[PDB]
Ligand binder design. Structure first.
Ligand SMILES: Fc1cccc2ccccc12
Length: 163
């Protein structure tokens, strides 16, 4: 169990352009292409990302390559963010995966409202943090995935992804 396996479970794998839970064009292992309603705009983003004319379809190797880039971008964004890095560095490896998972899903801007959750996590008040994390649009809109991530923060185990 590692961040790649965790996010592969949460995001799945699709080789043709699809829409994410918010209705946005996406491909691969949860790679957001664009928030624009234009499928042509999404196809342009895809071709730019892959480096060839894809017609909205990629290979598994390409999906996995984009995925590695996307995970790394989430990590480096945490490490460059003066608010997120201290909390991240206070966590054990399993809980760090839960943090990366959230940044992958929502970005640095999407986690900006989680200030109180971050404080509870840095204080290692795991049950309180879990309660606080669930008081969110994130939890209400993707509750099964949020429950898995929250259980990971609460327990520091992979139990939610083995179950
Ligand atoms: F503990 C954390 C560290 C860095 C980023 C995070 C994003 C969401 C939730 C928790 C985080």
């Amino acid at each position: 169990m590692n961040i790649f396996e965790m996010l592969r479970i949460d995001e799945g794998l699709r080789l043709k352009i699809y829409k994410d839970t918010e209705g946005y064009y996406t491909i691969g292992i949860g790679h957001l292409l664009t928030k624009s309603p234009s499928l042509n705009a999404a196809k342009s983003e895809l071709d730019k990302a892959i480096g060839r004319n894809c017609n909205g379809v990629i290979t598994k190797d390409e999906a996995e390559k984009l995925f590695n880039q996307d995970v790394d971008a989430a990590v480096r964004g945490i490490l460059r963010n003066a608010k997120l890095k201290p909390v991240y560095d206070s966590l054990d490896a399993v809980r760090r995966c839960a943090a990366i998972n959230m940044v992958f899903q929502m970005g640095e801007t999407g986690v900006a409202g989680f200030t109180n959750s971050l404080r509870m996590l840095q204080q290692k008040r795991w049950d309180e943090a879990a309660v606080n994390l669930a008081k969110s649009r994130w939890y209400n809109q993707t509750p099964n995935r949020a429950k898995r991530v929250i259980t990971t923060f609460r327990t520091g185990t992979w139990d939610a992804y083995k179950n």
